[PDB]
Design a binder for these strands. Structure first.
Ligand SMILES: Nc1nc2c(ncn2[C@@H]2O[C@H](COP(=O)(O)OP(=O)(O)O)[C@@H](O)[C@H]2O)c(=O)[nH]1
Ligand SMILES: [Cl-]
Ligand SMILES: [Mn+2]
Ligand SMILES: [Mn+2]
Ligand SMILES: [Mn+2]
Length: 553
RNA sequence: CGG
């Protein structure tokens, strides 16, 4: 049947100038040495990505799918969802969102300038009046930082971003935002990934794991997922949306956005030229996360049925997936996964790496992270979330005239606070830089999965207690996997090894303590791992007085 | 570019 794309031969052009690094990285050249390995994907590599994702799809459904789709619609039907006022939608546009072709940008939209509010009204009326004319879209390459891996080809080609003009995005939100906040949770319940913090993700997986008489786990990820999404898949997304109780005006807008935007359309590069046509998901539209998550859930739950996965518990995180099931013995389990992959491939969701059965929770990696284990202050086992730090370390080293890495550092410190690599390496480097800049008591802003919240470095110990618990300051005896991986990653980026970080950290601690106040609370809590005479830490009054539920839900 |  359908091709994912077709191209004119016009280049994918850059959204402005694309920054290369500088000869000195003053913030990060005491963190690591191999700055040559850190790189940023650019539009120069866009064509190679385009070759890798242009292919022919041949979806083939079956009773298992149909049965699942059916159940998902009955679940959707228990949702009622309102329209958003043009104004409400305007004010959810982010502060630096790409400006519109019709001579205004995000400032005008969020302030509700009349010029802007006007253009958008007319755009909405055209949605309601015309359910057919394709809507044009811009195509850009994403700028994104990685460490080179010669094992996996050297340098990654940039992924493709495909979005309509600002005005349409606002209309998108009007028609569909309230649904994005309610549907995924409603059809998937506890399987919905983006509702849990790290400690909750870990708790869920453990409960899941212990509930089985004899558990088996595996993860799945679809190769180039957005290009594998079919016109049919997209129309089937519409019907899932339509199964909620909605005002009539939503339905028309939703339906019109589907046929004119979501199922496909022409693509223009930044220079204005016609670039290609698209019959797959455009990553850049409002329905991207919801769509991926839901369409992934359907296919996956079908494939579980297709393959005989017994008593599955799922966690869906976009196109990443984990399933914890009752094992049928390794002979059968291996067969069943081949079947799963076979079904998923029939549903047009082929794998990147073939999945594999596992019987130890530390060896399953999904949503870029994994559960590991260490000992707590009282000798008991303590389970927590962590990840390969390679890419975090690389991003910690991205400095340009326009961009600072301190934000990245913070993001990781908060998300992965219990990790040996955050405690020994990142926390040590973070606090050291800020002390010396004399900017310890100055807010930064941290963004995990969507929005951006302001944080004061001196509040980390409270925020970490609230979010990860007080054991997060006291854990020891990390696992072989986790020790091996951290050492290896530090070697690979030319950063000092752990024993050096022990030295630097003692020194940082002392400085923090000598400044007294909150700084010294940072010193005692965050760096107690670093001294022989470990102190007695106690819950922090500050912590109880805190609401963080907006951060990961 | 979107949650
Ligand atoms: N809008 C948007 N969507 C993204 C981005 N990164 C990933 N996604 C979506 O999530 C899908 C799966 O992500 P991933 O497994 O990391 O990459 P892929 O499967 O190789 O495309 C993508 O195909 C996109 O639709 C991004 O930066 N912006
Ligand atoms: Cl303990
Ligand atoms: Mn994928
Ligand atoms: Mn319709
Ligand atoms: Mn993925």
């Amino acid at each position: 049947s359908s091709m994912s794309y077709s191209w004119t031969g016009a280049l994918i052009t850059p959204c402005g100038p694309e920054e290369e690094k500088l000869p000195i990285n003053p913030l990060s050249n005491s963190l690591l040495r191999y700055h040559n390995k850190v790189y940023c994907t650019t539009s120069k590599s866009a064509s190679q990505r385009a070759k890798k994702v242009t292919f022919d799809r041949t979806q083939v459904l079956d009773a298992h799918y149909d049965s699942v789709l059916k159940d998902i619609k009955l679940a959707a039907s228990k949702v009622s969802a309102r329209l958003l006022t043009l104004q409400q939608a305007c004010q959810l546009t982010p502060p630096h969102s790409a400006r519109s072709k019709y001579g205004f940008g995000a400032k005008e939209v969020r302030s509700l300038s009349g010029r802007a509010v006007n253009h958008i009204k007319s755009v909405w009326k055209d949605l309601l009046e015309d359910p057919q004319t394709p809507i044009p879209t811009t195509i850009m390459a994403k700028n994104e930082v990685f460490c080179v891996d010669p094992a996996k080809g050297g340098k990654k080609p940039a992924r493709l971003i495909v979005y309509p003009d600002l005005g349409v995005r606002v209309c998108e939100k009007m028609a569909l935002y309230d649904i994005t906040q309610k549907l995924p949770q409603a059809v998937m319940g506890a399987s919905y990934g983006f509702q849990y913090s790290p400690a909750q993700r870990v708790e869920y997986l453990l409960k899941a794991w212990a509930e089985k008489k004899d558990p088996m786990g595996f993860s799945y990820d679809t190769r180039h997922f957005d290009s594998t999404v079919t016109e049919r898949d997209i129309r089937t997304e519409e019907s899932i949306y339509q199964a909620c109780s909605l005002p009539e005006e939503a339905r028309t807008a939703i339906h019109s956005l589907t046929e004119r935007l979501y199922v496909g359309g022409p693509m223009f590069n930044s220079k204005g030229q016609t670039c290609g046509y698209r019959r797959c998901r455009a990553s850049g539209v409002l329905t991207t996360s919801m769509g991926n998550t839901i369409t992934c859930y359907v296919k996956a739950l079908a494939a579980c049925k297709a393959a005989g996965i017994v008593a599955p518990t799922m966690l869906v995180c976009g196109d990443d997936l984990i399933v914890i099931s009752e094992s049928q013995g390794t002979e059968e389990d291996e067969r069943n996964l081949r079947a799963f992959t076979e079904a998923m491939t029939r549903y047009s969701a082929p794998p990147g790496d073939p999945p594999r059965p596992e019987y130890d929770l530390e060896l399953i990696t999904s949503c870029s992270s994994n559960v590991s284990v260490a000992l707590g202050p009282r000798g008991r086992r303590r389970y927590y979330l962590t990840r390969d730090p390679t890419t975090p370390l690389a991003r910690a080293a991205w400095e340009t005239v326009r961009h600072s890495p301190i934000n990245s550092w913070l993001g990781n410190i908060i998300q992965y606070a219990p990790t040996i690599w955050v405690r020994m390496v990142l926390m040590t480097h973070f606090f050291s830089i800020l002390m010396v800049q004399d900017t310890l008591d100055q807010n930064l802003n941290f963004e995990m999965y969507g929005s951006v919240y302001s944080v004061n470095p001196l509040d980390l110990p409270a925020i970490i207690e609230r979010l990860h618990g007080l054991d997060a300051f006291s854990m020891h005896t990390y696992s072989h996997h986790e020790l091996t991986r951290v050492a290896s990653a530090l070697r690979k980026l030319g950063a000092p090894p752990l024993r050096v970080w022990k030295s630097r950290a003692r020194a940082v601690r002392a400085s923090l303590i000598s400044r007294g106040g909150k700084a010294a609370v940072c010193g005692r809590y965050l760096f107690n791992w670093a001294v022989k005479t470990k102190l007695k830490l106690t819950p922090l009054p500050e912590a109880r007085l805190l609401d963080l539920s907006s951060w990961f839900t």
